[PDB]
Design a protein around this ligand. Structure first.
Ligand SMILES: CCOC(=O)c1c(-c2ccccc2)oc2ccc(O)c(CN3CCOCC3)c12
Length: 272
């Protein structure tokens, strides 16, 4: 257990190369079950669930466990949403330690069409935007920008949540789910992408959904390479259409699965 979920266990010895999937923003790796059904028979799959920190800090926890599980390789890393960024971060980490990474699968992990500033001004604009939505959906003051600007994202939400309780009474499970979903989404926004010299496959939908765009309008635009071209020279794009939220489910996941199954077979053949 821990932060590793077994979706399909590998046999005691040998077997096919396992697929490592990484959780999405505000979700668990159970979302990869439809993908699992579209991969070849007896393909093992292990899901890495949420841990805390920057993307690099999260990868620092994941990579040692990956090596514990798969040693030298070969590594197949896959992720939808935040999971894609996490898969990529692990690939960089693993390659840096001399491991054999043969497949990185990004399921619509698309960068915003315009870069997202990590500035104090952007912090002010973000919470101004959030406040306005809050006014409308809850039918309800000055924003203490100076205190917010000094905090990181976790500090920011903690500050806002604390201030809210001072009336206001929100059940813990709803708060915590909104909190982790928010922070996971911000982790995508603030990811500092490093270059990777291996093969990356990007399954690309048409667009982000409306709710995502409301939160950060810069996601209203996608570049053809999904923003990965400058960091990845060996990049393949597999268009799948539909929306970001649909990309992980049937029927669209069948397209992803058919393509990905072809990649896995070549890996199994090259081993033999
Ligand atoms: C329902 C869609 O909500 C979100 O995507 C976001 C959420 C959120 C909040 C509560 C519950 C669920 C999600 O918080 C965000 C913070 C920044 C940000 O750019 C985004 C927009 N994202 C950023 C990453 O790329 C996809 C869109 C979000």
């Amino acid at each position: 257990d821990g932060f590793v979920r077994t979706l399909r266990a590998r046999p005691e010895a040998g077997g096919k190369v396992p697929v490592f999937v990484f959780h999405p923003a505000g979700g668990s790796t159970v979302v990869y079950e439809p993908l699992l059904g579209r991969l070849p028979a007896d393909t093992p799959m292990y899901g890495f669930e949420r841990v805390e920190g920057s993307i690099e800090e999260r990868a620092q926890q994941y990579v040692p466990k990956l090596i514990e599980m798969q040693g030298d390789g070969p590594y197949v890393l896959v992720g939808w949403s935040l999971g894609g960024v996490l898969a990529y971060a692990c690939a960089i980490g693993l390659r840096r330690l001399g491991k054999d990474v043969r497949f990185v699968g990004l399921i619509d992990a698309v960068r915003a069409g315009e870069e997202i500033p990590q500035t104090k001004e952007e912090i002010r604009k973000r919470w101004d935007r959030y406040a306005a939505f809050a006014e409308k959906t809850f039918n309800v003051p000055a924003i203490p920008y100076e205190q917010l600007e000094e905090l990181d994202d976790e500090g920011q939400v903690r500050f806002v949540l604390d201030a809210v309780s001072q009336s206001v009474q929100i059940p813990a499970g709803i708060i915590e789910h909104q909190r982790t979903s928010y922070l996971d989404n911000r982790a995508i926004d603030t990811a500092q992408i490093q270059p990777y010299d291996g093969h990356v496959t990007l399954y690309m939908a048409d667009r982000y959904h409306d709710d995502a765009i409301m939160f950060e309008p810069r996601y209203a635009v996608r570049q053809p390479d999904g923003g990965w071209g400058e960091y990845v020279s060996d990049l393949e794009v597999v268009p799948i259409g539909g929306e970001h939220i649909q990309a992980i489910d049937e029927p669209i996941i069948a397209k992803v699965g058919e393509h990905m199954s072809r990649a896995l077979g070549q890996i199994e053949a090259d081993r033999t």
